[PDB]
Design an enzyme around this catalytic site. Structure first.
Site, PDB file in Angstrom:
ATOM      1  N   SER A  65      -3.257  -6.037  -6.569  1.00 14.42           N
ATOM      2  CA  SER A  65      -3.390  -7.421  -5.949  1.00 14.42           C
ATOM      3  C   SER A  65      -3.695  -7.267  -4.456  1.00 14.42           C
ATOM      4  O   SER A  65      -3.312  -6.251  -3.836  1.00 14.42           O
ATOM      5  CB  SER A  65      -2.076  -8.193  -6.199  1.00 14.42           C
ATOM      6  OG  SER A  65      -1.035  -7.683  -5.382  1.00 14.42           O
ATOM      7  N   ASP A  66      -4.425  -8.222  -3.898  1.00 16.47           N
ATOM      8  CA  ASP A  66      -4.383  -8.498  -2.503  1.00 16.47           C
ATOM      9  C   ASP A  66      -2.871  -8.956  -2.117  1.00 16.47           C
ATOM     10  O   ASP A  66      -2.057  -9.212  -3.025  1.00 16.47           O
ATOM     11  CB  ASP A  66      -5.425  -9.520  -2.085  1.00 16.47           C
ATOM     12  CG  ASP A  66      -5.914  -9.301  -0.642  1.00 16.47           C
ATOM     13  OD1 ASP A  66      -5.113  -8.782   0.175  1.00 16.47           O
ATOM     14  OD2 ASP A  66      -7.082  -9.705  -0.317  1.00 16.47           O
ATOM     15  N   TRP A  67      -2.572  -8.986  -0.812  1.00 19.58           N
ATOM     16  CA  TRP A  67      -1.173  -9.009  -0.322  1.00 19.58           C
ATOM     17  C   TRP A  67      -0.681 -10.478  -0.329  1.00 19.58           C
ATOM     18  O   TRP A  67      -1.031 -11.250   0.526  1.00 19.58           O
ATOM     19  CB  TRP A  67      -1.136  -8.423   1.099  1.00 19.58           C
ATOM     20  CG  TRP A  67      -0.875  -6.891   1.177  1.00 19.58           C
ATOM     21  CD1 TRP A  67       0.072  -6.284   1.976  1.00 19.58           C
ATOM     22  CD2 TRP A  67      -1.529  -5.830   0.450  1.00 19.58           C
ATOM     23  NE1 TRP A  67       0.015  -4.915   1.847  1.00 19.58           N
ATOM     24  CE2 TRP A  67      -0.967  -4.604   0.920  1.00 19.58           C
ATOM     25  CE3 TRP A  67      -2.585  -5.780  -0.517  1.00 19.58           C
ATOM     26  CZ2 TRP A  67      -1.358  -3.356   0.410  1.00 19.58           C
ATOM     27  CZ3 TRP A  67      -3.016  -4.518  -1.020  1.00 19.58           C
ATOM     28  CH2 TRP A  67      -2.401  -3.317  -0.532  1.00 19.58           C
TER      29      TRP A  67
END
Ligand SMILES: *[C@@H]1O[C@H](CO)[C@@H](O[C@@H]2O[C@H](CO)[C@@H](O[C@@H]3O[C@H](CO[C@H]4O[C@H](CO[C@H]5O[C@H](CO)[C@@H](O)[C@H](O)[C@@H]5O[C@H]5O[C@H](CO)[C@@H](O)[C@H](O)[C@@H]5O)[C@@H](O)[C@H](O[C@H]5O[C@H](CO)[C@@H](O)[C@H](O)[C@@H]5O[C@H]5O[C@H](CO)[C@@H](O)[C@H](O)[C@@H]5O)[C@@H]4O)[C@@H](O)[C@H](O[C@H]4O[C@H](CO)[C@@H](O)[C@H](O)[C@@H]4O[C@H]4O[C@H](CO)[C@@H](O)[C@H](O)[C@@H]4O)[C@@H]3O)[C@H](O)[C@H]2NC(C)=O)[C@H](O)[C@H]1NC(C)=O
Ligand SMILES: *[C@@H]1O[C@H](CO)[C@@H](O[C@@H]2O[C@H](CO)[C@@H](O[C@@H]3O[C@H](CO[C@H]4O[C@H](CO)[C@@H](O)[C@H](O)[C@@H]4O)[C@@H](O)[C@H](O[C@H]4O[C@H](CO)[C@@H](O)[C@H](O)[C@@H]4O[C@H]4O[C@H](CO)[C@@H](O)[C@H](O)[C@@H]4O[C@H]4O[C@H](CO)[C@@H](O)[C@H](O)[C@@H]4O)[C@@H]3O)[C@H](O)[C@H]2NC(C)=O)[C@H](O)[C@H]1NC(C)=O
Ligand SMILES: *[C@@H]1O[C@H](CO)[C@@H](O[C@@H]2O[C@H](CO)[C@@H](O[C@@H]3O[C@H](CO[C@H]4O[C@H](CO)[C@@H](O)[C@H](O)[C@@H]4O)[C@@H](O)[C@H](O[C@H]4O[C@H](CO)[C@@H](O)[C@H](O)[C@@H]4O[C@H]4O[C@H](CO)[C@@H](O)[C@H](O)[C@@H]4O[C@H]4O[C@H](CO)[C@@H](O)[C@H](O)[C@@H]4O)[C@@H]3O)[C@H](O)[C@H]2NC(C)=O)[C@H](O)[C@H]1NC(C)=O
Ligand SMILES: *[C@@H]1O[C@H](CO)[C@@H](O[C@@H]2O[C@H](CO)[C@@H](O[C@@H]3O[C@H](CO[C@H]4O[C@H](CO[C@H]5O[C@H](CO)[C@@H](O)[C@H](O)[C@@H]5O[C@H]5O[C@H](CO)[C@@H](O)[C@H](O)[C@@H]5O)[C@@H](O)[C@H](O)[C@@H]4O)[C@@H](O)[C@H](O[C@H]4O[C@H](CO)[C@@H](O)[C@H](O)[C@@H]4O)[C@@H]3O)[C@H](O)[C@H]2NC(C)=O)[C@H](O)[C@H]1NC(C)=O
Ligand SMILES: *[C@@H]1O[C@H](CO)[C@@H](O)[C@H](O)[C@H]1NC(C)=O
Lengths: 832, 833
Positions: free
Chosen positions: A258-260
Site C-alpha cells: 500500500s501507499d502510506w
C-alpha cells in the site's frame, strides 16, 4: 456512479519466466514459517517505529531481517551522505535507455549500502494526464511507450544492483487534489472517500497500464498501489486493477504494497490482491492495524484462506531472492527520523535500547559524474538562433533570476523541498532526497567566465528590475533563469496544493525575461521546471536568442548546464511532453471542486487516450514546441525508409506451504516487551473477537466477502495473460523498420530518431510513438537505425474480446526527429 | 570658540629636492601662458560637464589636455572593466610595504590606461580618531607610523606608474556627522557651517600631520583639503594648515585641491593656500565659480597677486611633469556618468557633439592576482585553537551567514555600494569602484569542499536560525560570516549616516554565531568589516575555535579567504587597530548632536594623542585583541636585542612671476565660442570687472578681508622645522640602529611581523608608540637578523614653544616583539640629540 466489478480469486504466484528460481527458494523458506512469521512479512511495524519510512519485522528465527523500504525515485530520502539525482522527467527528456539504466544502478547501489532492501520507485503513475498534475515530474512522460521503456530500464538498473524496485503508483493517481480525506480536510474540503478515477477499459490498457506491463515484464519485484479510487473502489483493494489486470492479465509475480495510509480494510484488501501494508498501522501511530494481529485472526477464523497469506509471503520472499537481497543484507545503518549518532532504537515512542541509530555511511561513490552527465543530456535546447554554444570570450555576462542562485535557507533548508527558493533542482514531497551539496547555475557560470578573465554578475531578486535592466544593457549575453515548481499534495507552496494552480513562470519570471530581452540583444532563457510552462509571451521576442528547459537536474545542476552552454556537451535531449500556447490547449482539467456532494469527487477520464500530444493532434492545435522536439549543435538527416515483414490455459490449484495451529500458538510470547505503537502479528488471548478489537468482528462476514474470493481451485488463464507483461505472443516481432541517419553538421552529437505508427480507425490518435533510440554520430558519420514492431505495438485493446487485436484499418509508420517532423512514411503491409 | 591664527604669505614653490626638474619644466611652460590659461589649470569645468569626476579645461594652445581627476583610493570609480582592490585598511593589516607599493602600482596602471591623470587617493585622513568613524576604512590605521609608511609606499606605487596621487583628506575630517551643511540639513540638522575639529598644535604634529609629512617626503603631487573646519576655519582656506603646516613647515611642492563642495571663497582660499577648485562650480551645476572668471578678475583688479596664481599653475604643472603624465597623456576614454557607448560630449546639459564617450577599455591586466594575494595577506587570524588550517577532509561543512553569500541585486547592484547585502567586500560612498565580478566566500569554500568530495551548504539568511542550528549540529566545521559596514556621510544605510551607529555586528551576527556555536564544537568566525567590532559576547565561547577578520577584500574575497583557511597562505596579517570590550573603552566619542546652537558643531580633540591603543594603554584597559596582534600557522621567537649609536636655507627667495598679465579686454569671452550650459570658464563677460564678476560683495571692504601678509611677495624666514621635504632634513638623520634575531620556531614556512615600539618618557606621553616594523618570510627553523634605524624625528616630541621637534631629556627605551602588548625584549636608549 462508476462501478468497479469484482475479479476473484487473487491469483497465486507460479514461478513464471525469470521468477522460477526465486519462487522455489521463497516456497522452500515460507514452508518453514509459522502463521505469525508470515504475517510479520506482510505488515509494517508502525509509523516511525524503526529506521526506514516503511519497515516490516522480518522473521528472526529464520534469519530474515525486517525489510527496510525507503523513498525516493531520485535518491535516498531522509538520510545522509547520499546523492540527489535528476528527477524521472529528466530521464524522460534524455530519451536514453542506457542513462535510465545507469541512474537505476547508481541509485540501487546507494540504497543497498544504507541497508535498504526496497527502493520506493521508479514511478510511471501519474503518467501525466494533466500538465499541472503535482507529481508528473517524478515519473517520465505522458507518452506510454517512452515512459514504459525508461521505467523498465530504471527498474533493471536498481534491481541488478541488489535492491527490490517498486513500480508506483498503481494506478490512475493523476492529480493531487482530493487524493486523501485528511489532506482534503486540511485544505478546507469535506469528502467521505478519496477522488475516484473513472476510466474505460480500452484507455486504461492503451495508456495508463502499458508502462506497468513493461515494468512487470522487466522483472520489477514490487508494485505500490495508490491512494485514489478507481471507479469507486480504493486502489489498494481494487480487485479488478490488482487481481485481474496486474496479477491475472500482466502475470505479476511480485508483491503489492500500500501507499502510506492507502490501506483501508483487512479482509477486503487481502482478498482483492494486496500483499503488504505500509507503514503498517491504520493511521500513523494508531497502535492498530488492518493486518498484523487482525490478519493472523482472519486466517485462524477461516475468513482469509491460508493459501492467500501463504501467497503474500511467497511473493514477498521471491522478490527479495530475485534481486539477491539475502546476499547483501544488513540492518538499515541510518535513521529516517533523526540525524543524531545515538538515539532510542524505536523512534516514535522513544523506547528500546539507547544506541547508535546513524552510522554516517558515505554511499556517494563517484555518482556525481552520472548526475552531471544526465543533467547535461536532459537539457532540451528548445530554441537557438545561432546563440549557443558560448565561447567563453563574451566580455560581460549577466546572470539573471532567483533560479540561478542559492536557496538562502541552504539547499536542504525547506523540509521535503517544500519551497521554491533559489535554483529549482528538485520538486517537493516524499519524492525527494537530501542534497549532499547543490551546484547552482550562478556558481558554475561565474566560475566558467572567471576562467576566461571575463566580467560576470548575478542578480537573483526577480523584482529588482531596475538593476536587471541596467546590467542587461551592459552585457554581451544575458542568461535568464526561471522556474515553476509543484509536488506531492500534503505540502502547499504559495497556495499550490501539490498540483500547480497554473503553467505560468513563478517569481515574476515572464516580467524578468522581458526586462532582460528589452535591453540585451542576446538574451538566453533557462527554465527549471516540473513540466511545461507557457512561453507564449516572450518565446519569439527578437532579442530572446535561445531557450533551454533543464527540468529538475539534482545536485550538479549548474555544472550540467554550463557543460551544455559552453559546448562541452552537445545537447541531445528532446521534449518528453508538449509545450502548448495556453492551458486550455491541453484540455484534461484537474478536478478542483467537490462534484459529488461530500462524497468522493468523481474524476471522469472522458478524453480517453487523448492526453498531451495525442489531444493536441486530434484537435489540430499547433504546439509551440511539440513532443519529441529538441535542437542540437549539429544537424541530422533521416533517409532511406525500409520495411520488412518478419516470419497454459488453466492455473494450478492454490498451494499452502507449512501448517497453521491453534490460537494459543499466536498469543504474545511471554518474555517479550511490547514497544508502544509497535505493530505485532500476535493475539492478546485465544479469544479472537476480543483480540481483534474490531467493532465489525464476525458480523455479516460472508456477505462482505465477494463471490470467488476464497476459491483455491485452478482458474482459467485470461486470453491476454499467460506470460510476463501479457500473453507472450504480444511480444512476437512482426515487422522490421530501418532508416539511415547521418550527422550533416560540424559537431559530434546524438540523434534521437523516433518511430510513430498510425493504427487507423475513427477513434485512434493520428500518430503514437512506438520506438526510439539515441545514437551518437560524429560529423558526416552515418548509421542504419533498425527496430521492430511487436504484435502489441500494432494492436488496440478490444473490450469484447478482452484481448489486444490488430484491427483491420490500414496502418502507417513514420520516422523522423519529432512528433511533428516526420519526413519518412510508408503504408505498413497487413500482418496479424 | 577655537580660533585659527593667520599664516601668510602662501609659500611659493622652489624646486625642492626631487622636484628640481619638474619645477624647471613647469616654470618654462607656465611662463608661456596667458592669465586665462593659468586660470583654466586651477578650476574644474563644473559638475558632470566632462568625463571625470573632476576635470579641468587644460590649455589647448600649448597642447595641455584637461586634467582628469578620478576616485577612488581602491580602484577606478564610475567606470568599466577595471579592478576592485582591497580597502586601505586591508593594506594596513598586511603590515607589508611591498604589497602597499604593488597595489599602488596596479592601480596607477589602471588609472593611466583609462586616460586619468590624477588618482584621488590614497587616504590617511581620517586617521581613525573614533572606531565608528564612517571613512576610517579608506585610510590605514589610527597609528601614525604604520599609516605614514604604507600611505607613502602606496603613493610611490601610483606615481611610479605615471599618475599623480592625491594625499587626502587634509586634515582632521575624523567623522562624517555635520561634515557638510546641506548633507546635515538632509538629515534634519540645521547648521550654518561644517563641524570644526579643534586640536592643539602638539597633537596635530604627533598624530594627524605625521602621515602627511611622509606623503610629502615620498613625492606626492597633490593634496586634497577637507570639508570640516579646523579651529573654525574651513579646511580649503585654512592658512595655518595649508600655508604654515603643509607648505612652509612640510615643504610641500605640489598642488592643493578642494574636496567637492569644500571650496568656500575665491580671494580668501587662493591667499590661504588652495591651488585647484573641484568640481569647479560653487554648488553642483550652479554655473558660478569662486574661481574661473572670478579668479581672472581677482588678479586683474589687484586683489590676488599675480605671483599667487602663477604659483598655483607652477605647482599643478610640476606635479603633472613629476610623474611624467605628459608622456602618457590621452583624453579620458570612458565617462563617469553613463556606460553608453555614444552620448553628448557634455553630459550634464546634454550638449556638444554627439560622439563616442565610452571605449570599454579593459585595464585589469592580471591585477586579480595582487588583489587575491593582498586579501589573503590581510586576513588577521585573531584566535585559532588548533582549528586551522582545514585539510579538506572535513566531512560536512556548514557555511553560515549572509556575509558568505551573493548580493541579490548583483555585486554592483547598490549605487556607490550603499547597502550591506551579501558578502561585504567594499564599503560605501565615493571611495568605491565597480567590481568586474565578486567571488563570494560561499563560492570559493563550496568549490574547495567539492574538490575533496565533501558535503557542503550555505545558509545566508541570518534570521533562519532553525535551519542554522539543525545544519550546525550535523557539521564537522561551521564557518560563520558576519560583518559591519560604514561609508561616506551622503549615504545612510539602516539609519547609519556614514558613521556607524554602533560597533555591533550587523544583520543578527551575534545571534547567528551563538546559534552555530551552541550546536557545533568547531565553529569558526570570519568577520568582514570597516573596523573593529565588539566580539565580547562570543569570542570566548568554548565552541568558537577560530576567529578571523578579513576587512574589505575587493573582488577576489572568497579566494583570498579560502587560500588562508586551507593553508595555501599562512596568515601573517596583524590587527591595525584595537578590539575593545566595549565602545566606551575607546573613548573618543563622535559628535552626534548640535552643541553650538545652529552654528558649526564643535569637535574638541580633548584626548590629544590618546586614540586607539595609546588610549587603552593610558587607561590601563586590556583589549581583547591589541593593536599589532595576529596569529600564524607557525610560531616565531625574538632574541638578541642590540642598539648601536650612529654618527638648509634660512630664507626663501622673493615670489616670482612668470609671463605677463594684459588688459581686461584680453580676457573677455572669445567671440567665436559656443558657451556650454553650466560649463565653468576663465573669461569675462565685458571689461567691466564688477559686472563680469556678478559677486554681491565685489569691492566691499576689500582691504579688511585681505589678511595682513597675504600679498607679501618678499623673502620669508624658513621655519625651524621646515626647509626640507616632510620637514627639516636633520629630522631624518639616523641616530640609532637596532637589531634583533627573529626565528621561525614552528613547523611551516610563514611571515613574521616584528614590531619596534619606543617609550619617549614624560608624564603625558603614551607608554609605547610604534616606530618600525617589517614583514619577513621564514622557513621552519630559519633565523634572520632584523635591523632598522630610529631617526631624530622618531625620538622627538613636538615642542610648541620652539615650533620644532625636540628630543626631550626623559630617558627613552626601545621594545621589540610581536604586538603592542607582547614585547619580550627591552633596552634603555643612550642620550642622543
Ligand atoms: C475473522 O477476523 C477478521 C479480522 O478481524 C474479521 O474481519 C472483519 O470482517 C468484517 C465483516 O465481518 C469487516 O467489516 C465489513 O467491512 C466491509 C468492507 O469495508 C471495506 O471495504 C468497503 C468496500 O467493499 C466492497 O469492496 C471490497 C474490496 O475492495 C469488498 O471486500 C467488499 O465485499 C465490497 O465489495 C463490493 O463492492 C465492490 C466494488 O467496490 C465489488 O467489486 C464487489 O463485487 C462487491 O459488490 C469500503 O467501502 C470500506 O470503507 C469504509 O471503511 C474505511 C475504513 O475502513 C473508510 O476509510 C471508508 O471511508 C469507509 O468508511 C465508511 O464505512 C465504515 C464501515 O465499513 C464506517 O465505519 C465509516 O464510518 C464510514 O461509513 C472498507 O474499506 C464493510 O462494507 C462492512 O460495513 C458495511 O456493512 C455493515 C453491516 O454489516 C454496516 O454496518 C456498515 O455501515 C457498512 O454498510 C455499508 O455497506 C453495505 C454494503 O455492504 C450497505 O448495505 C450499507 O448500506 C452501507 O453502505 C463492514 O465494516 C471488517 O472490515 C473486517 N476487519 C478486518 C480487520 O479485516 C472477520 O469478521 C472474522 N470472521 C469471522 C467468521 O468471525
Ligand atoms: C515480528 O517482528 C518483530 C520485530 O522485528 C519481532 O520482534 C522482535 O523479536 C525479537 C525476538 O526475535 C525480540 O528480541 C528480544 O530483544 C530483547 C531486547 O534486546 C535488547 O536489549 C537487551 C537487554 O538489555 C540487549 O541484550 C540486546 O542486545 C538488545 O539491545 C532481548 O532482551 C531478548 O533477548 C532474549 O531472547 C533472546 C532470544 O530471543 C535470547 O537469546 C536472550 O538471551 C534473551 O533470552 C532471555 O529472555 C528470553 C525471552 O525474553 C527467554 O526465553 C530466555 O530464556 C532468557 O530469559 C532470561 O533472561 C530474561 C531477561 O533478559 C529473564 O526474564 C529470564 O527469567 C531469564 O533469566 C530478545 O533478543 C525483539 O525485542 C522484538 N522487537 C520488538 C520491537 O518487540 C518478532 O519476533 C517477529 N515475530 C515473528 C513471529 O517472527
Ligand atoms: C579652458 O578650457 C576650456 C575647456 O577645455 C577650453 O574650451 C574649449 O576651447 C576649445 C579650443 O578653442 C574649443 O574648441 C573649439 O571647438 C569647436 C567645436 O569642436 C567640436 O565640434 C565641431 C562642430 O561640429 C567639430 O567640427 C569639431 O571637430 C569638434 O568636435 C571648433 O569648431 C573650434 O575649432 C577650430 O579652431 C581651432 C584652433 O583652436 C583649429 O585648430 C580647428 O581646426 C578649428 O579651426 C577652424 O576654426 C578656426 C577659428 O578658430 C579657424 O581659425 C581655422 O582656420 C579653422 O577655420 C575653418 O573652420 C572654422 C570653424 O568651422 C570656420 O568658422 C572658418 O572660417 C574656417 O572655415 C575649436 O576646436 C572648445 O569648444 C571649448 N570647449 C568648451 C566646452 O567651450 C578653453 O579654450 C580653455 N581656455 C584657455 C584660455 O585655455
Ligand atoms: C500562477 O501561480 C503563481 C505561483 O503560485 C502565482 O504567483 C504568485 O503571484 C502573486 C500575485 O502576483 C505574487 O505576489 C505578489 O508578489 C509581489 C512581489 O513580492 C516580493 O517582492 C516585493 C518587491 O521587492 C522589491 O522591493 C522590495 C522593497 O520594497 C525590496 O526589498 C526587494 O529587494 C525588491 O527591490 C527592488 O525594487 C525596489 C523598488 O520596488 C528597489 O528599490 C530595489 O533596489 C530593487 O530594484 C517585496 O515587496 C515583497 O515583500 C516580496 O518579497 C508583491 O509585490 C505583490 O504585491 C502587489 O499586490 C499586493 C497584494 O497582492 C499589494 O500589497 C501591493 O500593493 C502590490 O501592488 C504580491 O504579493 C507571488 O509572489 C507569486 N508567487 C510566486 C511563488 O511566484 C501567480 O499569481 C499565478 N498566476 C496566475 C495568472 O494566476
Ligand atoms: C555673463 O553673460 C552670460 C551670457 O549672457 C549671462 O547669462 C551671465 O549671467 C553673465 N554673467 C554675469 C556675472 O553677469
Amino acid at each position: 456512479l462508476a462501478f468497479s466489478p469484482p475479479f476473484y480469486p487473487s491469483p497465486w504466484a507460479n514461478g513464471q519466466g525469470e521468477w522460477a528460481e526465486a519462487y522455489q527458494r521463497a516456497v522452500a523458506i515460507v514452508s518453514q514459517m509459522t502463521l505469525d512469521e508470515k504475517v510479520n512479512l506482510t505488515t509494517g511495524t508502525g509509523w516511525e517505529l524503526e529506521k526506514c519510512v516503511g519497515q516490516t519485522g522480518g522473521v528472526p528465527r529464520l534469519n530474515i531481517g525486517g525489510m527496510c523500504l525507503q523513498d525516493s525515485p531520485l535518491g535516498i530520502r531522509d538520510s545522509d551522505y547520499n546523492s540527489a539525482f535528476p528527477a524521472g522527467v529528466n530521464v524522460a527528456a534524455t530519451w536514453d535507455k542506457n542513462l535510465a539504466y545507469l541512474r537505476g544502478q547508481a541509485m540501487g547501489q546507494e540504497f543497498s549500502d544504507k541497508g535498504i532492501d526496497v527502493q520506493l520507485g521508479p514511478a510511471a503513475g501519474p503518467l501525466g494526464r494533466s500538465p499541472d498534475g503535482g507529481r508528473n515530474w517524478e515519473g517520465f512522460s505522458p507518452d506510454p511507450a517512452l515512459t514504459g521503456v525508461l521505467f523498465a530500464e530504471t527498474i533493471k538498473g536498481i534491481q541488478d544492483a541488489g535492491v527490490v524496485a517498486t513500480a508506483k503508483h498503481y494506478i490512475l493517481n493523476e492529480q493531487e487534489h482530493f487524493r486523501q480525506v485528511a489532506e482534503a480536510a486540511g485544505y478546507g474540503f469535506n469528502i467521505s472517500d478519496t477522488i475516484s478515477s473513472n476510466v474505460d477499459d480500452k484507455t486504461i490498457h492503451e495508456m495508463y497500464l502499458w508502462p506497468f506491463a513493461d515494468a512487470v515484464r522487466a522483472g520489477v519485484g514490487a508494485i505500490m498501489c495508490s491512494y485514489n479510487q478507481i471507479n469507486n473502489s480504493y486502489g489498494c483493494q481494487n480487485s479488478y486493477t490488482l487481481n485481474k489486470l496486474l496479477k491475472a492479465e500482466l502475470g505479476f509475480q511480485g508483491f503489492v504494497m500500500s501507499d502510506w495510509g492507502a490501506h483501508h480494510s483487512g479482509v477486503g484488501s487481502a482478498l482483492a490482491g494486496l500483499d503488504m501494508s505500509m507503514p503498517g498501522d491504520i493511521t500513523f501511530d494508531s497502535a492498530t492495524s488492518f493486518w498484523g494481529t487482525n490478519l493472523t485472526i482472519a486466517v485462524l477464523n477461516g475468513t482469509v484462506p491460508q493459501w492467500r497469506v501463504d501467497d503474500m509471503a511467497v511473493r514477498i520472499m521471491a522478490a527479495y531472492y530475485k534481486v539477491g537481497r539475502d546476499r547483501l543484507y544488513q540492518p538499515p545503518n541510518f535513521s529516517s527520523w533523526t540525524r543524531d549518532e545515538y538515539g532510542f532504537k524505536y523512534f516514535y515512542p522513544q523506547e528500546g535500547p539507547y544506541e547508535k541509530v546513524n552510522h554516517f555511511v558515505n554511499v556517494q561513490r563517484n555518482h556525481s559524474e552520472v548526475i552531471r552527465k544526465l543533467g547535461a543530456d536532459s537539457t532540451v535546447l528548445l530554441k537557438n538562433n545561432n546563440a549557443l554554444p558560448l565561447t567563453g570570450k563574451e566580455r560581460k555576462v549577466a546572470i539573471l533570476g532567483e533560479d540561478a542562485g542559492s536557496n538562502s535557507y541552504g539547499a536542504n533548508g525547506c523540509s521535503d523541498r517544500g519551497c521554491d527558493n533559489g535554483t529549482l533542482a528538485m520538486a517537493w514531497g516524499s519524492g525527494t532526497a537530501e542534497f549532499p551539496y547543490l551546484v547552482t547555475p550562478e556558481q558554475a557560470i561565474q566560475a566558467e567566465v572567471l576562467k576566461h578573465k571575463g566580467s560576470v554578475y548575478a542578480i537573483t531578486d526577480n523584482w529588482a528590475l531596475s538593476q536587471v535592466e541596467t546590467l542587461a544593457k551592459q552585457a554581451s549575453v544575458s542568461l535568464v533563469f526561471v522556474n515553476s515548481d509543484a509536488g506531492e499534495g500534503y505540502i502547499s507552496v504559495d497556495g499550490n496544493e501539490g498540483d500547480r494552480n497554473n503553467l505560468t513562470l513563478w517569481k515574476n519570471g515572464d516580467n524578468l525575461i522581458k526586462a532582460a530581452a528589452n535591453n540585451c540583444n542576446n538574451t538566453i532563457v533557462v527554465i527549471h521546471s516540473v513540466g511545461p510552462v507557457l512561453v507564449d509571451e516572450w518565446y519569439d521576442h527578437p532579442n530572446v536568442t535561445a531557450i533551454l528547459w533543464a527540468g529538475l537536474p539534482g545536485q550538479e545542476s549548474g555544472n550540467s548546464l554550463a557543460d551544455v552552454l559552453y559546448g562541452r556537451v552537445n545537447p541531445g535531449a528532446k521534449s518528453p511532453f508538449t509545450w502548448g500556447k495556453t492551458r486550455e490547449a491541453y484540455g484534461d482539467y484537474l478536478v478542483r471542486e467537490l462534484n459529488n456532494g461530500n462524497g468522493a469527487p468523481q474524476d471522469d477520464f472522458s478524453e480517453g487516450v487523448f492526453i498531451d500530444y495525442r489531444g493536441f493532434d486530434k484537435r489540430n492545435e499547433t504546439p509551440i514546441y511539440e513532443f519529441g522536439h529538441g535542437l542540437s549543435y549539429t544537424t541530422f538527416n533521416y533517409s532511406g525508409l525500409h520495411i520488412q515483414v518478419l516470419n497454459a490455459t488453466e492455473t494450478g490449484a492454490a498451494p499452502t506451504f507449512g501448517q497453521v495451529g491453534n490460537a494459543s500458538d499466536y498469543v504474545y510470547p511471554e518474555g517479550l516487551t511490547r514497544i508502544s505503537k509497535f505493530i505485532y502479528p500476535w493475539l492478546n488471548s485465544t479469544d479472537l473477537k476480543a483480540s481483534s478489537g474490531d467493532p465489525y468482528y464476525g458480523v455479516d462476514t460472508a456477505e462482505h466477502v465477494p463471490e470467488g474470493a476464497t476459491d483455491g481451485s485452478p482458474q482459467p488463464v485470461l486470453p491476454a495473460g499467460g506470460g510476463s507483461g501479457g500473453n507472450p505472443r504480444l511480444y512476437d516481432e512482426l515487422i522490421r523498420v530501418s532508416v539511415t541517419v547521418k550527422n550533416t553538421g560540424r559537431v559530434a552529437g546524438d540523434a534521437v530518431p523516433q518511430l510513430y505508427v498510425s493504427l487507423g480507425g475513427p477513434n485512434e490518435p493520428k500518430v503514437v510513438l512506438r520506438k526510439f533510440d539515441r545514437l551518437t554520430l560524429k560529423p558526416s558519420e552515418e548509421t542504419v537505425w533498425t527496430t521492430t514492431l511487436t504484435r502489441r505495438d500494432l494492436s488496440n485493446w478490444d473490450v469484447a474480446a478482452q484481448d489486444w487485436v490488430i484491427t483491420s484499418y490500414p496502418k502507417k509508420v513514420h520516422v523522423g526527429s519529432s512528433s511533428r517532423q516526420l519526413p519518412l512514411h510508408a503504408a505498413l503491409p497487413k500482418v496479424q
